[PDB]
Structures are given as C-alpha cells and as structure tokens.
Amino acid sequence: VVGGTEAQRNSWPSQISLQYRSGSSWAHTCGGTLIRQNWVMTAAHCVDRELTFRVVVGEHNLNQNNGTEQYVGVQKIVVHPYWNTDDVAAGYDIALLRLAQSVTLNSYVQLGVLPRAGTILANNSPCYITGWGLTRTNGQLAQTLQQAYLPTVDYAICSSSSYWGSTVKNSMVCAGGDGVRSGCQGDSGGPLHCLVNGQYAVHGVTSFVSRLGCNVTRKPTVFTRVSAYISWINNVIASN
C-alpha cells in the first residue's frame, strides 16, 4: 500500500498473509480474506506459481512476533475455472484456499463479511485497502499492516479512456486513482473493505495496478468484485 497509514492491530481481523516457502523461511507474497475458519479468498494470480503456500491469520508485523499469529498450511486450491493468467483484464481473478486446519477466532482473527450478491457501490463510496504490499512503486513490503482510504470509481468512469478503458470490466471494482494512495505489489489477493449501512464488508479482492506504477493518477487500483462471485464461492465451499 502506497500512501497508507499503519492499521490498528484489531481493525481488519479477516486480513491474512499468504506466504510461500523460500529456503529455510517463508516470504509474504499476497493478501487474502478469511471467509470460513478453514477457507481463504484470494486472487487467482497469487497462486499461479507452483509453490508451497501457508496462510498466517492474526498477523500484524511480518518482521516481529505479535503474539497473535496462527500458521496454517494450504490444503487445496480452487481457482476460478475461467481464470486465464495471461489475461488478467478478462477478470475471474479469484481463488479459494482450503486450510489444513480450522483457525480459532478472536479479536485478531474473524471472518470477512461479504456483500450481498449483485451489490454495486455508488461512485466515490468510502473504502480502505489493506495489506503488506510495497509502500512505493518499486519499493519494499511494509513490515506492519497498512491501510489506505480509496474511494470507489464507478464503471462508467473507470472504463473511460483516460482511466482504464476496455481493461476494466463490470466484474471488477475500481478504487483510488488519486496519484498518492494505492495498492501495490504484495497487496494482491487482499481485501477492499467498504462501509455500507454501518458495516464494513469485503467488496474487492486486489487484482492489478498499472504497469507504469502503483500510485498513478487515473489508474485506480482494480479489484475483483466479490459480489459477482457469491454463488461461485458458495458452490466451491459446499462441494469441498
């Protein structure tokens, strides 16, 4: 997250860190949202590589013992069947991870609530992106979980020619684009939390930013629209 602030450690208890085994250690690669005690929602592109993955719930500082973490292996990966890794702009950038164990819930570990199917946010709706992604274009991962306020940019604007044009689909949510605050590499797969009727819900799964940089004016961060995938999510969980 570029232009973020440090999150309070109990603000976003559904945020997870998706990590891969790297030598004798683990490296953060993506975010995700805990949606059942044994299921995480993330981006398909985060699990394109044939790596050994684990999820960390209750994580705050990637570089220090928080006293709250639970570490759990990924047992099964179900990518959306229409995902095509060389065409992110087509959409379908979503995957579910079944965890090897069911995590224990507490103030640091909660299920993300999802929007009702079909919900589309009005332009300029208030949301936060959260994650440990790069803090500058071509920078480094954050140590502590970051948040940035990114108001939505509706389809009509986001798919206009000075924004994303044809690359943004109605199955996506755009947020931000102010040139200061954005998602960045390593935030992929994590949540966009939007406040609706008094309650934050996870409306987005971080999918892409501009090849020209993270915080680029009129290139808002692009997310998979969770509300387009409610039936898919339920179908996967019920069949696994």
Segment near Na ion (CB under 5 A), from 40-48, 55-63, 142-150, 162-170? 55-63
- Taking the complex as a whole, the smallest distance from the CB of residue 70 to Na ion amounts, in Å, to 11
* Number of chain positions touching Na ion (CB under 5 A): 2
Q: Is 38 annotated as a binding residue?
A: no
Q: Is 64 annotated as a binding residue?
A: yes
- Bridge partners for 50 per DSSP: none
Quickly tell me which residue has 């004798």 as its tokens: 24
- Taking the complex as a whole, the smallest distance from the CB of residue 123 to Na ion amounts, in Å, to 37
* Residues 65-94 within binding reach of Na ion (CB under 5 A): 66
Quickly tell me which residue has 């949540």 as its tokens: 191
Radius of gyration of the chain (CA): 16
Residue nearest to Na ion (CB): 66
Residue 35 to residue 145: CA distance in whole angstroms = 19
Q: Which is nearer to Na ion, 61 or 123 (CB)?
A: 61
Q: Is 197 annotated as a binding residue?
A: no
- Taking the complex as a whole, the smallest distance from the CB of residue 201 to Na ion amounts, in Å, to 26
Segment near Na ion (CB under 5 A), from 57-65, 174-182, 199-207, 224-232? 57-65
Report DSSP state, residue 166: G
Q: Which is nearer to Na ion, 37 or 66 (CB)?
A: 66
- Bridge partners for 149 per DSSP: 128
Answer for which of 61, 123, 144, 171 binds Na ion (CB under 5 A) is 61
- Taking the complex as a whole, the smallest distance from the CB of residue 59 to Na ion amounts, in Å, to 5
* Residues 173-212 within binding reach of Na ion (CB under 5 A): none
Burial class (CB in 10 A: 0-12, 13-18, 19+), 78: buried
Q: Which is nearer to Na ion, 28 or 225 (CB)?
A: 28
Distance in angstroms between the alpha carbons of the first and the last residue of the chain: 33
Active site residues: 45, 93, 188
Q: Is 69 annotated as a binding residue?
A: yes
Annotated binding site for Ca(2+): 59, 61, 64, 69
Note the residues at the interface with Na ion (CB under 5 A).
61, 66
